[PDB]
Design an enzyme around this catalytic site. Structure first.
Site, PDB file in Angstrom:
ATOM      1  CB  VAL A  81      -1.109   0.093   1.247  1.00  0.00           C
ATOM      2  CG1 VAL A  81      -2.081  -1.246   1.064  1.00  0.00           C
ATOM      3  CG2 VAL A  81      -0.255  -0.022   2.515  1.00  0.00           C
ATOM      4  NE  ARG A 129       6.501   3.959  -4.238  1.00  0.00           N
ATOM      5  CZ  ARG A 129       6.389   5.371  -4.261  1.00  0.00           C
ATOM      6  NH1 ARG A 129       5.964   6.014  -3.060  1.00  0.00           N
ATOM      7  NH2 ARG A 129       6.573   6.202  -5.214  1.00  0.00           N
ATOM      8  CG  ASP A 180       9.404  13.214   6.607  1.00  0.00           C
ATOM      9  OD1 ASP A 180       9.471  13.852   5.668  1.00  0.00           O
ATOM     10  OD2 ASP A 180       9.424  11.965   6.086  1.00  0.00           O
TER      11      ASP A 180
END
EC number: 2.7.11.1
Length: 327
Positions: free
Chosen positions: A39, A41, A150
């Site tokens: 789902v 990467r 992030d």
């Protein structure tokens, strides 16, 4: 530079809280979990919908790409310290493959909609709502002495049907210690704060607030992403062309930073452009003066001037969301 809030969290807590290198991982059973489909990467991992063979409940399987044990231990400790926090992904198990010793992190299942398709349909209220939910996650992690580093749409998973939000991928996150010089090679280029782009290493939780501000600007102006640089230098240029170089130099002088002459020349000189100019027919229904006021208080060169996550949650922009929550 020091954080204006939560600066002493890791000072007051036991070294075992933040000394992630001393982590001892109690490996689970790899066979308890079966991959169902890929789902997602990234450079550091692949993510799969999985099934827990025992209770037959859905979960998420994050298979880690090869990296030093230090980085793996760091993500695990941060996940364990944040487990149970509002809108934080829940780490359920950790397993490794015998032969390869490839580690996988197992999380509670999260059922997301592609942000690129979701965002265009969000109503002004949905924006206010989801941003507030993300703020809860950031105030929590900062309060526990951690910076995500992030923040970006790809790391904010949203179930629009269920209106549930989760801040994911703690793989770049770090513990905050006053005076520590961190690596500036963190966050996605479009979400990197000026401190990263000018080599200011003693940054803090406020970095995440710039990132949030980038997301927010993207959403209200329907402009993904908002600061579209091709490399790190171009990133600062694009920021400068909106915020203006006057404030940039004020900032650089305050923290005694000298820009690279090359970078200095790319940046050049530019007047500040008012937020309203980005207003247009597609975005108009999303852009209250309260939106602009909130956005302006996030996207500041000076990390110390930015709203904290706590302050952000109380800005009047979110009043309706707070009223609703309070029932």
């Amino acid at each position: 530079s020091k954080a204006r809030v939560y600066a002493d969290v890791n000072v007051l807590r036991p070294k075992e809280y933040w000394d992630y290198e001393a982590l001892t991982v109690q490996w689970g059973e790899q066979d308890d979990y079966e991959v169902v489909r890929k789902v997602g990467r990234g450079k550091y991992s692949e993510v799969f919908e999985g099934i827990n063979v025992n209770n037959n409940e859905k979960c998420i399987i994050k298979i880690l790409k090869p990296v030093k044990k230090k980085k793996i231990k760091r993500e695990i400790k941060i996940l364990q310290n944040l487990c149970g926090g509002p809108n934080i992904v829940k780490l359920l198990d950790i397993v490794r493959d015998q032969h390869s010793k490839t580690p996988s992190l197992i999380f509670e299942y999260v059922n997301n909609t592609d942000f690129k398709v979701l965002y265009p349909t969000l109503t002004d209220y949905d924006i206010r709502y989801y941003i507030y939910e993300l703020l809860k996650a950031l105030d929590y992690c900062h309060s526990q002495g951690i910076m995500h580093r992030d923040v970006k749409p790809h790391n904010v998973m949203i179930d629009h049907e269920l209106r549930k939000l989760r801040l994911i991928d703690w793989g770049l996150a770090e513990f905050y210690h006053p005076g520590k010089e961190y690596n500036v090679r963190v966050a996605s280029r479009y979400f990197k704060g000026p401190e990263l782009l000018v080599d200011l290493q003693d940054y803090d939780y406020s970095l995440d607030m710039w990132s949030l501000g980038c997301m927010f600007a993207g959403m209200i102006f329907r402009k993904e992403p908002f600061f579209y640089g091709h490399d790190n230098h171009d990133q600062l240029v694009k920021i400068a062309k909106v915020l203006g170089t006057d404030g940039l130099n004020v900032y650089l002088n305050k923290y005694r930073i000298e820009l690279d002459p090359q970078l200095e020349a790319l940046v050049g000189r530019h007047s500040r452009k008012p937020w309203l100019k980005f207003m247009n027919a597609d975005n108009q229904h999303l852009v209250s003066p309260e939106a602009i006021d909130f956005l302006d208080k996030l996207l500041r060169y000076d990390h110390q001037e930015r709203l904290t996550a706590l302050e952000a949650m109380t800005h009047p922009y979110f009043q309706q969301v707070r009223a609703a929550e309070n029932s």
